[PDB]
Design an enzyme around this catalytic site. Structure first.
Site, PDB file in Angstrom:
ATOM      1  N   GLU B  56       0.758  -1.246   0.112  1.00 55.14           N
ATOM      2  CA  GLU B  56      -0.049  -0.042  -0.157  1.00 55.14           C
ATOM      3  C   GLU B  56       0.901   1.256   0.136  1.00 55.14           C
ATOM      4  O   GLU B  56       1.827   1.429   0.715  1.00 55.14           O
ATOM      5  CB  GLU B  56      -0.783  -0.028   1.145  1.00 55.14           C
ATOM      6  CG  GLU B  56      -1.718   1.269   1.133  1.00 55.14           C
ATOM      7  CD  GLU B  56      -3.244   0.998   2.228  1.00 55.14           C
ATOM      8  OE1 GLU B  56      -2.971   1.195   3.399  1.00 55.14           O
ATOM      9  OE2 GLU B  56      -4.229   0.285   1.765  1.00 55.14           O
ATOM     10  N   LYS B  58       0.581   5.119   1.117  1.00 59.74           N
ATOM     11  CA  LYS B  58      -0.163   5.987   1.805  1.00 59.74           C
ATOM     12  C   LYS B  58       0.724   7.077   2.343  1.00 59.74           C
ATOM     13  O   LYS B  58       1.990   7.052   2.889  1.00 59.74           O
ATOM     14  CB  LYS B  58      -0.654   5.591   3.172  1.00 59.74           C
ATOM     15  CG  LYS B  58      -0.966   6.397   4.303  1.00 59.74           C
ATOM     16  CD  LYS B  58      -2.008   5.705   5.296  1.00 59.74           C
ATOM     17  CE  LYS B  58      -1.554   4.404   6.026  1.00 59.74           C
ATOM     18  NZ  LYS B  58      -1.362   3.213   5.165  1.00 59.74           N
ATOM     19  N   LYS B 117      -7.903   2.493  -2.653  1.00 56.53           N
ATOM     20  CA  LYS B 117      -8.145   2.397  -1.189  1.00 56.53           C
ATOM     21  C   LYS B 117      -8.971   4.053  -0.882  1.00 56.53           C
ATOM     22  O   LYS B 117      -8.327   4.903  -0.999  1.00 56.53           O
ATOM     23  CB  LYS B 117      -7.038   2.265  -0.455  1.00 56.53           C
ATOM     24  CG  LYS B 117      -7.442   1.634   0.841  1.00 56.53           C
ATOM     25  CD  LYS B 117      -7.345   0.235   0.874  1.00 56.53           C
ATOM     26  CE  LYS B 117      -7.487  -0.545   2.139  1.00 56.53           C
ATOM     27  NZ  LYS B 117      -6.650   0.056   3.269  1.00 56.53           N
ATOM     28  N   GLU B 166     -14.982  -5.358   2.497  1.00 55.60           N
ATOM     29  CA  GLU B 166     -14.470  -5.379   4.005  1.00 55.60           C
ATOM     30  C   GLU B 166     -15.772  -5.674   4.945  1.00 55.60           C
ATOM     31  O   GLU B 166     -16.912  -5.611   4.574  1.00 55.60           O
ATOM     32  CB  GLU B 166     -14.125  -3.855   4.579  1.00 55.60           C
ATOM     33  CG  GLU B 166     -13.618  -3.728   5.876  1.00 55.60           C
ATOM     34  CD  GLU B 166     -12.938  -2.680   6.395  1.00 55.60           C
ATOM     35  OE1 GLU B 166     -12.279  -2.781   7.485  1.00 55.60           O
ATOM     36  OE2 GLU B 166     -12.687  -1.735   5.509  1.00 55.60           O
ATOM     37  N   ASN B 187     -10.051  -6.517   8.672  1.00 52.19           N
ATOM     38  CA  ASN B 187      -9.094  -5.974   9.683  1.00 52.19           C
ATOM     39  C   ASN B 187      -8.881  -6.310  11.121  1.00 52.19           C
ATOM     40  O   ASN B 187      -9.978  -6.773  11.522  1.00 52.19           O
ATOM     41  CB  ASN B 187      -9.414  -4.356   9.637  1.00 52.19           C
ATOM     42  CG  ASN B 187      -8.193  -3.392  10.164  1.00 52.19           C
ATOM     43  OD1 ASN B 187      -7.297  -3.688  10.829  1.00 52.19           O
ATOM     44  ND2 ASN B 187      -8.224  -2.349   9.257  1.00 52.19           N
ATOM     45  N   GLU B 217      -5.390  -7.456   7.192  1.00 59.44           N
ATOM     46  CA  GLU B 217      -4.795  -5.976   7.416  1.00 59.44           C
ATOM     47  C   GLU B 217      -4.470  -5.832   8.831  1.00 59.44           C
ATOM     48  O   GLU B 217      -5.307  -6.280   9.769  1.00 59.44           O
ATOM     49  CB  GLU B 217      -5.605  -5.126   6.785  1.00 59.44           C
ATOM     50  CG  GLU B 217      -4.836  -3.775   6.995  1.00 59.44           C
ATOM     51  CD  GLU B 217      -5.566  -2.587   6.000  1.00 59.44           C
ATOM     52  OE1 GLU B 217      -4.848  -1.406   6.100  1.00 59.44           O
ATOM     53  OE2 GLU B 217      -6.574  -2.806   5.396  1.00 59.44           O
ATOM     54  N   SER B 218      -3.287  -5.681   9.356  1.00 58.42           N
ATOM     55  CA  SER B 218      -2.930  -4.866  10.599  1.00 58.42           C
ATOM     56  C   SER B 218      -2.508  -5.921  11.536  1.00 58.42           C
ATOM     57  O   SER B 218      -2.822  -6.996  11.323  1.00 58.42           O
ATOM     58  CB  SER B 218      -4.241  -4.150  11.274  1.00 58.42           C
ATOM     59  OG  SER B 218      -4.824  -3.147  10.455  1.00 58.42           O
TER      60      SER B 218
END
Lengths: 472, 472
Positions: B56, B58, B117, B166, B187, B217-218
């Site tokens: 990603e 960002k 995103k 999601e 997530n 994710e995370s």
């Protein structure tokens, strides 16, 4: 065989390496080698998935454009992966300086189909190529009779290796169709006498099945040649002309897209999209009565945020070009109104040449609506690194005859005047080396706060059109 | 909706940009937008075509591992294209610092499927995403009821945009199956309370159709976590943990493959294949009674030819480590025989720490067959940057119990002892951070002049196995 002397010694050399190769992969279970899952055929046959090029990694080269410390086929492949539809790797050691480690390095580096460029006479060379990451092999019909080819093509098919089938003439074409070749290699260079005949690809492409791909090699000097030949060749194989230069990425962009400028850059993200799309040159306007005027603070942020454009400082002044020079300025664009004579134009240019020193290119911008315009262009062509010829003549319409312009002038010129996604094909048809792209890729008046800014979608479209253009 | 406060303000912010977006693409013929020809689904669902990651871009990030002058999503994408199966680009402007120019820059740069995103509530965001090069979009079931999702999924389908759907829980999973989602986003972070629950991906993966892909994710800190979670997640979405570091390429390699060393490098092409395959560390042996001994002349040629390994100088000496230091030496590996006590080992290390200065890491190599071995390892773990634990005990067999080793020691350790393509899975199962790879990727005795040299085919195989390994 009746092989050129150089080729003769290369295959006999390769024969004498076969024991080495057999010992080198002795421990390998040939039977259990995984298949290639990358189709060179498809990559070449579709518009998507890379530009119309197989880009080649070759160690042995004078490369006098640059100082060569070490061959880095990973670093080359990293740049090629960005532009090409395949990567070629010389695996021949004694005169090309190649090895199977080079092939493996490139296979692990790039997502593209990898071609082993070798003189293949023995199955063990096919087996070694797959074990070290090849997706495709070269088989030369000049070297192999129909039986030797069929046997090696069959070893290739075991492991889903594509074949590049080299053919010198109409008889080799017939043999290749006979043997069901899908990818035809044509060299414009006759190895016997080193003659180049660019026509050899057009001439043979008429005889090749419509469901087959043609790759041509040699004498593809520049984008102009790519556009002349691109109607009848699916792909060009090139390498030494990219790796012999100071910056391989910039060289790749210049060959694929040509020497195009996106002028009137005012934002980092605009410069970043331009470079990503394929622009070689970025234009920075210093004139304060411009909606694209940039402060020295913004100028230097853009250069810093996108170091990989060659920046061009654009001014309407007749002197004071030293004040414009900043780290990253590659050229100054004299955008002053046309002077009174050719001699005053030759003088202005010599005066700026004088101000900026021999490390900064000097470009002349000219409106072809100015009656003196064409005359200055033809006169001043040798005094400048680039002409920017503005071909939109306004209300009069196009009074100037573009058929009268010498090839030398065109080769030095970027065409300007509202160049846009929609008029790109017809601008490219003029046959200038480059395009100067500005107001034609901005958002229009209806775009709210985005009006007048570079439109990234328009940049994507115009560079896609540039990448596939060929004379029709 | 009952949205976390932060998310609440983000969608309402995005609502307030919609007029801008509508004006920004007003001139675009939505109806004639080309379809995406890059399937995020397939890239994620197949082993080939990149490692198990969406990487990603960002802008908004403290990034205190490094000094950030300018956001360069092209430069990030250029590195990601080498490792990942997709690229994510934040298009949200007010808190992520994103824009559609970033999306276009990445689309023109990378061959991979590109994900927008964004917090998508309106069709114009779908339309803008395709015009600026997206291949896929995020739709959040927490934000969109079944009708709002169906309508936006239908706009997406017009243009062959993949959807990342999601889902926070079992109810959102059921909704997603209902709506026929192909790519499930989980997530591990609960946005309400900022809790991480790594289990949330395992737990939900049981409820997701077998023909669907799960992206999590995370909290994916390191390769160890990737291997713990990789049995039930098809892909991990990561970014800030790669772009917050001094070298994005080296960070990508360390996450994907782990901190692995290929030791006993004697040739540029061996170092080049190691780096291309995914090695972070390259080993250089200074001991002159070695078949892998390298002269200071060869050492410096290898470093120069492959600058993108972190080089480790390996010596059996107890002092004189200053003599080994050369430009590009990142660490020294103390390969001296084990000393008499823990205290002598702590002293040797402090003495070398002293010789090389705080800019050169200090590693201790230990044979676990040495009775003091494990005790030293556990004792000296905090004093070193890496342990190299040799787990091949020779004729005795494996007398040491690997279940007794603390997590802290393993996290600091590369496992050694004839590590090879064939024993790689079982070495990785031990749960050390890294592998030390040397004699096990050399050509065997039958290989003629290639015997004892690094085998590039073996390097390709062992790094492929490392890239897909997960605890079973």
């Amino acid at each position: 065989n009746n092989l050129p002397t150089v080729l003769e010694s290369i295959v006999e050399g390769r024969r004498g390496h076969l024991e080495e190769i057999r010992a080198r992969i002795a421990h390998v279970d040939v039977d259990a080698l995984p298949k290639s899952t990358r189709s060179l055929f498809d990559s070449l046959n579709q518009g998507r998935g890379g530009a119309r090029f197989i880009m080649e990694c070759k160690s042995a080269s004078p490369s006098l454009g640059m100082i060569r410390e070490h061959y880095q086929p990973g670093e080359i492949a990293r740049v090629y992966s960005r532009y090409a539809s395949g990567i070629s790797v010389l695996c021949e050691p004694d005169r090309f300086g190649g090895d199977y480690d080079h092939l493996a390095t490139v296979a692990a580096t790039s997502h593209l189909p990898v071609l082993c460029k070798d003189f293949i006479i023995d199955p063990v060379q096919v087996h070694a190529a797959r074990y070290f990451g090849a997706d495709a092999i070269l088989l030369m019909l000049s070297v192999l009779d129909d039986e030797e080819y069929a046997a090696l093509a069959a070893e290739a098919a075991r492991f889903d290796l594509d074949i590049l089938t080299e053919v010198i003439d109409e008889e080799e074409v017939a043999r290749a169709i006979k043997l069901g070749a899908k990818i035809f290699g044509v060299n414009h260079r006759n190895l016997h006498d080193l003659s180049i005949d660019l026509d050899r690809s057009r001439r043979l492409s008429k005889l090749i099945p419509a469901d087959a791909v043609l790759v041509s090699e040699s004498g593809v000097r520049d984008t102009e040649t790519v556009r002349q030949l691109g109607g009848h060749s699916n792909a060009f194989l090139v390498g030494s002309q990219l790796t012999s230069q100071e910056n391989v990425d910039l060289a790749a962009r210049e060959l694929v897209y040509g020497p195009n400028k996106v002028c009137g850059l005012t934002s980092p993200s605009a410069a970043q999209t331009a470079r990503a799309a394929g622009a070689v040159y970025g234009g920075l306007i210093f004139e304060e009565a411009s909606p694209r005027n940039v402060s020295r603070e913004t100028l230097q942020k853009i250069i810093a945020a996108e170091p990989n454009l060659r920046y061009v400082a654009v001014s309407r002044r007749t002197s004071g070009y030293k004040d414009l020079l900043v780290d990253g300025i590659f050229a100054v664009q004299i955008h002053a109104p046309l002077q009174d004579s050719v001699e005053a134009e030759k003088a202005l240019i010599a005066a700026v040449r004088e101000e900026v020193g021999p490390q900064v290119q000097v470009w002349r911008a000219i409106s072809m609506s100015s009656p003196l315009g064409a005359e200055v262009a033809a006169a001043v062509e040798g005094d400048v690194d680039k002409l920017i010829l503005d071909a939109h003549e306004g209300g009069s319409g196009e009074v100037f005859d573009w058929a009268t312009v010498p090839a030398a002038v065109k080769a030095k010129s970027l065409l300007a005047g509202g160049i846009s996604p929609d008029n790109a094909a017809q601008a490219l048809a003029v046959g200038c080396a480059g395009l100067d792209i500005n107001s034609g890729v901005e958002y229009p008046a209806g775009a709210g706060t985005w009006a007048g800014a570079k439109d990234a979608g328009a940049l994507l479209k115009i560079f896609a059109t540039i990448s596939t253009f060929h004379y029709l």
